[PDB]
Amino acid sequence: VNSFSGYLKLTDNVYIKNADIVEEAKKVKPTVVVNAANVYLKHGGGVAGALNKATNNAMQVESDDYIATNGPLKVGGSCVLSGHNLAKHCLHVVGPNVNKGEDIQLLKSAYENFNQHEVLLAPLLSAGIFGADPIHSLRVCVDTVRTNVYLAVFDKNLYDKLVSSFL
């Protein structure tokens, strides 16, 4: 049993809810929240900007030190950093950004990072301002992630379309 509430079960391991991932993280304090990161960990907008704002910019300060030491992530890659006030850990995962021309095949590689964690609160990778089709992102998630993933979908309209089109 875990603390996640109000989710719709899609598969053995994947759950979905219409929720603000920031508000959900603040309520649950999950072991792992996933950030929709870029390779520079520049948390300007979308999920990343909202998560970082909720940490009062402490996520960005920590991320800048990580990049100064390690250099940029790979598209499809990840790193584990603090979850600050939102979670124990934040798994920063880089899905391909269609609005930068990145290979959508890298979305599966991005979701493979989730398998290193038994339970996660996450957004749909490469959705929103990353430009991918969220229906596709949900299909890749279900077909790639084997650990237990609780997906928070920001738009109510999109949530209802993801559920009503799910195979």
Ligand SMILES: O=c1ccc2ccc(O)cc2o1
């Ligand atoms: O300001 C916000 C608050 C949460 C949030 C959550 C997801 C997203 O794509 C954008 C967002 O912007």
